Amino acid sequence: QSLEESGGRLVTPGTPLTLTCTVSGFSLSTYNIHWVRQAPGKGLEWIGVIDTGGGTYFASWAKGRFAISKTSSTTVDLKMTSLTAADTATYFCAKGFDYSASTNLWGPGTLVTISSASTKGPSVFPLAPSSKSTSGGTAALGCLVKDYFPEPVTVSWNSGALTSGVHTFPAVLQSSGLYSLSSVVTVPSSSLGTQTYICNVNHKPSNTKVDRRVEPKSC
Amino acid sequence: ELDMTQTPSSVSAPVGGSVTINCQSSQSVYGNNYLAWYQQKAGQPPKLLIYRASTLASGAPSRFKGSGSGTQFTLTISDLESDDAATYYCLGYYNGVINVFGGGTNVEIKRTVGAPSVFIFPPSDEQLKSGTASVVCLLNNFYPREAKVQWKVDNALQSGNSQESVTEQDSKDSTYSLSSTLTLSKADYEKHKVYACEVTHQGLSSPVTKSFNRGEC
Numbered sequence: 132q133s134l135e136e137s138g139g140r141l142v143t144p145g146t147p148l149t150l151t152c153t154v155s156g157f158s159l160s161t162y163n164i165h166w167v168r169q170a171p172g173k174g175l176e177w178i179g180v181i182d183t184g185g186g187t188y189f190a191s192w193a194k195g196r197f198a199i200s201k202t203s204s205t206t207v208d209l210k211m212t213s214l215t216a217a218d219t220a221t222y223f224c225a226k227g228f229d230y231s232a233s234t235n236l237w238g239p240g241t242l243v244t245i246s247s248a249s250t251k252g253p254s255v256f257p258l259a260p261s262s263k264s265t266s267g268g269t270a271a272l273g274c275l276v277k278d279y280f281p282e283p284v285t286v287s288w289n290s291g292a293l294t295s296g297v298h299t300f301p302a303v304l305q306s307s308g309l310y311s312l313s314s315v316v317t318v319p320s321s322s323l324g325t326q327t328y329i330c331n332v333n334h335k336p337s338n339t340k341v342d343r344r345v346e347p348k349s350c
Numbered sequence: 351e352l353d354m355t356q357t358p359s360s361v362s363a364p365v366g367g368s369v370t371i372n373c374q375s376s377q378s379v380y381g382n383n384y385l386a387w388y389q390q391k392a393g394q395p396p397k398l399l400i401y402r403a404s405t406l407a408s409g410a411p412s413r414f415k416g417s418g419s420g421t422q423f424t425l426t427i428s429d430l431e432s433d434d435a436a437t438y439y440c441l442g443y444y445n446g447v448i449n450v451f452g453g454g455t456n457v458e459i460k461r462t463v464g465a466p467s468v469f470i471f472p473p474s475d476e477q478l479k480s481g482t483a484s485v486v487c488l489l490n491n492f493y494p495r496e497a498k499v500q501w502k503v504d505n506a507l508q509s510g511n512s513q514e515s516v517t518e519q520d521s522k523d524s525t526y527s528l529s530s531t532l533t534l535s536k537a538d539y540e541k542h543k544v545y546a547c548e549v550t551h552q553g554l555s556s557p558v559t560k561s562f563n564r565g566e567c
């Protein structure tokens with residue numbers, strides 16, 4: 132039993148936007164659906180709810196800018212109008228047992244960006260030590276994911292097989308107006324000659340998919 | 351119109367310790383008890399801990415306890431573990447079909463001071479082909495969060511051309527990590543030789559330095 136949001140993307144202000152909550156393993160004839168959002172670095176904010184009969188109710192601030200509809204036995208749309216930069220956020224849907232937004236079943240979220248800037252895909256550069264021996268028995272390796280817009284980018288290591296010792300940093304907005312993000316991992320020095328370490332980078336908004344192998348630079 | 355005020359915004363406590371998080375509503379919640387508590391970590395949706403003021407959500411551990419009624423509610427986390435480092439929210443339901451989240455509370459696990467492991471990374475030849483040079487300094491697995499990075503280029507202290515990012519507190523060892531990125535034009539990078547990262551932190555009796563020379567392995 133799960134939910135998954137989709138449709139979060141970059142649009143210019145005033146462009147209408149529709150998000151979709153796709154559900155699996157429970158019935159919309161039995162459960163309600165809540166929508167919640169969260170601006171970058173901010174707290175959770177309730178938007179509204181649709182009940183089993185399709186009746187909808189919203190936060191006082193919505194003011195008719197938002198609408199909810201059940202479009203099939205497994206899908207629920209959130210339609211948004213008069214969008215501005217204030218509406219840039221990650222949007223969640225959640226299974227409602229009742230009208231209370233208290234529930235243990237949430238989607239992962241879909242990210243919405245309201246901006247007139249254009250999409251740009253990142254370059255991916257190695258963060259590599261000069262030597263296998265530069266820092267003793269442990270080495271740090273990394274990937275610099277530079278100059279993209281909008282959010283998000285995801286990074287994993289070795290196709291998800293390597294998670295321990297991984298630190299993927301929050302994106303920083305550069306003065307250029309593009310984001311940059313670094314991801315690093317600490318690994319044993321003693322096998323750097325033969326073990327492969329690859330960062331798997333994805334920037335879905337630009338259809339950018341890059342695997343970068345990182346190792347110490349040769350002299 | 352109605353306010354949900356969550357306090358404190360931040361609290362620090364040791365493993366084995368306890369914290370109390372408070373929510374005060376300007377108006378009684380629905381049925382006097384429709385108040386829920388959530389835990390949230392970076393990049394994830396919130397996880398339900400408590401609902402109806404005091405009912406433990408299936409699969410949340412016993413050390414989370416909710417209490418209260420009307421307009422005043424408390425979440426008490428006892429026997430703190432590293433995994434409890436997170437942001438916590440209350441959520442009230444109200445007459446008129448209204449839900450309101452509290453502003454949130456960040457819970458930090460207070461642990462012994464630990465020095466950072468520092469690493470430095472020169473710009474890649476790939477990047478240099480497009481006119482910019484990024485130099486990165488990594489400070490790995492330290493506590494507490496505060497740390498200072500000073501870049502030096504041929505012993506000139508850099509100012510205004512670096513940006514930092516910090517991870518959320520680690521759920522296993524309660525440490526932070528930080529990356530600092532020094533951005534130079536390729537032209538500037540190639541006019542200088544010695545690149546150094548100097549790191550100041552409570553776990554270090556004096557600042558530690560890592561350096562490299564451009565084009566010298």
Ligand SMILES: CO[C@H]1O[C@H](CO)[C@@H](O)[C@H](O[C@@H]2O[C@@H](C)[C@@H](O)[C@@H](O)[C@@H]2O)[C@H]1NC(C)=O
Pocket residue numbers: 160161162163182183184228229230
């Ligand atoms: C805890 O939620 C359950 O009890 C409440 C109150 O009696 C009830 O309203 C819930 O019914 C659901 O929500 C209402 C608004 C309608 O949409 C109804 O069709 C829903 O089933 C009930 N939840 C469940 C899952 O039975």
